[PDB]
Amino acid sequence: HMTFCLETYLQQSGEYEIHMKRAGFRECAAMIEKKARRVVHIKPGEKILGARIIGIPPVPIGIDEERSTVMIPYTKPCYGTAVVELPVDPEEIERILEVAEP
């Protein structure tokens, strides 16, 4: 379960990533649901572009707590919002640092 296609979402509806490299392993499920409104995905394993860039000018508000907690972004794009929550410790961040862009 994984998808690295970013610009393909643009071809479908709208962009939500930067034309870099997205690593959406577990968030691959979330992205599908994120298109609807805003969805939280438990056990995320993505790394979007290394840095989260929607590409579309959004509202820069957001409450990111921890990786092992939900992040409640108030970014209004032309796609949807991403909420991720890992039930595992932020120890996953070590891989995530590398997985920034595989």
CA angle in degrees (0–180, nearest 5) for 48-5-43: 50
Across-strand partners of 72? 63
CA dihedral 97, 42, 33, 60 (to 10 degrees): -50
The CA distances from residue 64 to 1, 5, 26, 60, 67, in Å, are: 25, 25, 19, 12, 8
DSSP string, 37-82: SEEEEES--EEESSS---SS----EEEE--TTS-EEEE---SS-EE
**Is-contact 1 45, C-beta < 8 A?**
no
Q: Which of 51, 43, 50 is nearest to 27 (CA)?
A: 43
In the chain, residues preceding a discontinuity (C to N beyond 2.5 A) are none
Give the method of determination.
NMR
Q: Which of 14, 1, 93 is nearest to 47 (CA)?
A: 93
Q: Which of 48, 44, 1 is nearest to 20 (CA)?
A: 48
Q: How many CB atoms are located within 10 Å of the residue 63 CB?
A: 9
Burial class for 40, CB neighbours closer than 10 Å (0-12, 13-18, 19+): middle
Q: Which residues contact 29 (CB under 8 A, 6 or more apart)?
A: 1, 41
